[model samples]
Target: TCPFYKKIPGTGFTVDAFQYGVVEGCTAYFLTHFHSDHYAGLSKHFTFPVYCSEITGNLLKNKLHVQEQYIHPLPLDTECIVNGVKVVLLDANHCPGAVMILFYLPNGTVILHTGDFRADPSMERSLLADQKVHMLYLDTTYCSPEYTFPSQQEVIRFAINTAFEAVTLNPHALVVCGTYSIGKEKVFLAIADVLGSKVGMSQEKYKTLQCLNIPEINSLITTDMCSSLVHLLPMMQINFKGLQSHLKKCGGKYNQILAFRPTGWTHSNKFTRIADVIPQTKGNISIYGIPYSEHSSYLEMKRFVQWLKPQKIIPTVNVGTWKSRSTMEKYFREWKLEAGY
Candidate 1:
């Protein structure tokens, strides 16, 4: 979502900016999560001392097959000394193993890098609350006023109830969820638990989830097509053509398909204002584009920026163009000013 900043100020540390060849003067690399955009340019050939959460580190080895010697796994909420700088990883609440990085520079400057996070109330009690944050590298995925939406807990409840209602009216409806490789695992897991249904996925995808080591999910996942009506597929395969072929592959066991397309882009008022679960029907498939984002909404972003009271705000998403960066910067200035700082 952001270009590599070359290197962090006053340090030889580079973060999430690996698209370019070996960064100059970079002594080590800090990864915030396993998302492609964040971890782009990383490969088995690229060698640098890489640091991340234990779960993220495991994924690097299992999925990307990066060398074990270079991968350093750090525990969450614990301060550690890396190259003489104090660092701590906090749960980002965006995806499994995703972390918001806190760096205490040699000069005592406190920097908080929010690597794509969904704001949660628990953060108010973290170590961040007690210290002064001089700079904030925020996840501005939904940083505009037009992108406000409900919380993850609220949206998950809505999806569970909506899916139940759909199946209640038509007992043979197959439920499908669109998800990324490492994100939105909670949405489908919750729905499957509520319906008492076995979660299904492709054999390859099943292996991917196993890397997470989530005990609760391991027992619920199955590769059998007819074993469960609830299935998970990549985001690209949630459309009519994808579901049509998927239903046929299930051997006519299902009468219709109920697909949930959860994403941040589904929050526009033009389509979702009428209902939280907006459904579009075509043939035997019905798609619900619910606002189930792992990023902070506009209101949430404003609240966080104000609460953190950072002297400088650096947007991490939608910065490819000058216009977008200007707009995001404007919002940051307004919020920081409103906090009476």
Candidate 2:
């Protein structure tokens, strides 16, 4: 029944933000990111203080309009006292402000709550190299074999190359990119730098990007109503209907529409995996998908488990495969019957 946040019985640790149904008796709610799924139940009226990265704190105040008093910014790699529990934060490598929360319990237990994240051995090593983790709240968004996808940089490169080629072929065609409000900003920033012009985004997007303070992401942003051919829209707008609606608004000002959706789902669609940045075209539009993901792949998670060798794992998702500890180990193949991986 756990959707996002899960409370450990003997500790004050939580993976994600709190929900209305199961938020009672917790000292404070730890937020990993500012996504709607994680931060929906959190507002100015939230029950307890919400802990997150510095960027995520600003997002809550500016985007979600949560007051600053309740937003606690946990610096990376620094220990903070939260209701008497020692807490630490680390980079999640998912988005600008995402982080993994590590909790040190009173009874000699350490808990790691990996908010949505992709695997990076260097950063992970920095956080996990010197300690032992008793419990792990793993991000299982892509915990199955069918979800194996390439790295974010690899996938972003492919999609951006594909978008550039599409734009080059049809200079007059409208370019639509599907991405989350906070994530996949790298694609838009790269496109803007390549085009030597500003891209389009909602006011919220511009503000959020500015707050993130990414130095190389200095390309530029304009309102969507601008005449620019490239319009950056939310991930929800990547579908056919979303594309058609944008075209309708253009009112034939553009010859056609080309959309690119950068997501891990593209890995499961081989036909969309074109080489040399080529794209697929159909009807009056061209659509492409790149498998850029924020969560760990099956192998990635398996390796992470082997590295940490946590005493227990709680599969993270609305509904996941967190049955018996042995079953979980078998599913992830972490048991070798020898102190084992």
Candidate 3:
């Protein structure tokens, strides 16, 4: 068993531990977001009181079908008692319902759990900077030095401009963007707005977007494949074979396809320019792998740790084995020394 996933000491609280079954002494369960990894094993059968953002609560009830009675949708940046400890939720900038949980224990210990966040500039300006966090449960998805990449805004602009140019060159080509169940809505939405194109999606995905209560969605989405030139699809379906299947299904309406495979894996340490990243072209389909990510880069992670000045860090990712855990700790060690703590 991973020690990182265990319940917090001196409290009846467990954060994203539903997969391990109910912890014996835990009185309250906390969900950081609606992402499958974080919300895995959470079901209608769970009887424990759950805490999360309002959007996450709605998603859990509507998408996952969790009971509303057990779900507690807490307000952001506001302190309130959860069982005995004081708690606050902060915008994670990762996804629609994701949050960084801040806990104030009875014994004066403060803990910050970053539930898969993008460390934006606004973080230091928030209430978190004012509090002295004793322990940080960080989202170390990109904690390595080699993982530094561009900001979300930069990547979104690149996707929009790139797609816009592609659409102009091949006006009849279908534009398919890669996206997750909840995250990466901005990239595709920006592309849709810039190109003045309708986004096509299945009824189920459209319904999920509705739960987030996105304002510009009604006019942007279309159910008919023949109507919209742009489509929002799962990341796995944006491949060559996937696009080939889609092209086959649509008959001969579109001769070529422009698919966007947005992800962080495409980033290169050798290059910083968005145009430097290459695209894959195979016959009738071209896939652009944009360097877009929901998690912070290595530099962003350091900035966040130094800015927050947490006394201790407990990595939530790359902690499966002892060597990986220690390797992750080395980054923290460097950051802590850089901060002179």
Candidate 4:
């Protein structure tokens, strides 16, 4: 990981006036993707020169409203240098603009910071082509074997099939789904690609889609614009009574109503609240819970580390306190690392 040159809030390190920071100096700041978690701190706090793929740049500027001056867009597979650090952006198939960064240091240390990537056979081949990774900052969010999930394509197929079945059963029913604004384009695309119809979008969703160059889907209709076709609503906007009223209205006109949502809805227990509201359907509003995720699974993380064969593997983001340290130490011991976190 790159060192912080300047003083940052919440990190108790003493202020250093001239240390080379991750953003300040000594090479480029390669943005892995446009996900808020990865770029949230940089969006508001840091304003140094940064490098990312063209797709990532467009999303940051057009979607997230980030200024263009702060971003230097480079095409994938192209090599560029900033502040003496060699940076290359490789395709990370997790999302539209996701990427894996190859940081080639002057000291011959090549570090690969894989930002929340999944294991795609295509991506794996492309990543291993360099054949010179010294260290890896892997995304191990789903590092437990118990967290297995279906492949993205398989999940997408299930989502589309479930949506179609729901809509066919109830022509007037409104379908709702919840997903993050940044990465939901793929979900919508899956629907569009399978149905061969334009997915409906609210003005806000339309704006987000525009950033990714996604065209409007025919079946898509925003809540405000859902006067005729099925209404697609965000899960966050629906409370108990509101969901009931909306479903009741849809059931009155449409034969059935269907809704699609991420697995998080089930995890958070909001599905029951929505079910309680709609009585006619008897909680049968087709709820399609897809296993699509943006994070890498445990096996993927293990494989990445095994391939890199780093002398030391340090985990970040979860190493702030003693309790966290114990958890990381268990992982380190499992991986045979001398130290962790």
Against the unseen true structure, what C-alpha lDDT does each candidate score?
Answer: 0.84, 0.72, 0.83, 0.57
For 77-170, candidate 1 gives per-residue lDDT tens digits of 9989999899999999888899998999999899999888988767978989989999888888888888867667788888889888888899
Best by lDDT: 1
TM-score, candidate number 4: 0.75
- Cα lDDT tens digits, model 2, 194-309, are 65567777776677777785765544677754557678888888777777778887777877887777766643443444353455666787777666677777778766777778
Model 3 misplaced regions, further than 4 Å:
1-5, 266-269
- Between which residue pairs do clashes occur in model 1? none
lDDT of 2: 0.72
Clashing pairs in 3: none
Question: lDDT by residue for model 3 over 130-231, one digit each (tens)?
Answer: 768899888988888788777778888778788888879888788898777688888878888898877888888887887786776689887886888888
TM-score, every prediction: 0.94, 0.85, 0.94, 0.75
lDDT of 1: 0.84
How many angstroms is residue 238 displaced in model 4 relative to the true structure, after the best TM-score fit?
Answer: 5.5
Model 4 misplacement above 4 A: 1-28, 41-47, 214-224, 227-232, 238-240, 245-255, 264-284, 332-341
What is candidate 4's local distance difference test score? Answer: 0.57
> What's the lDDT for residue 199 in model 3?
86
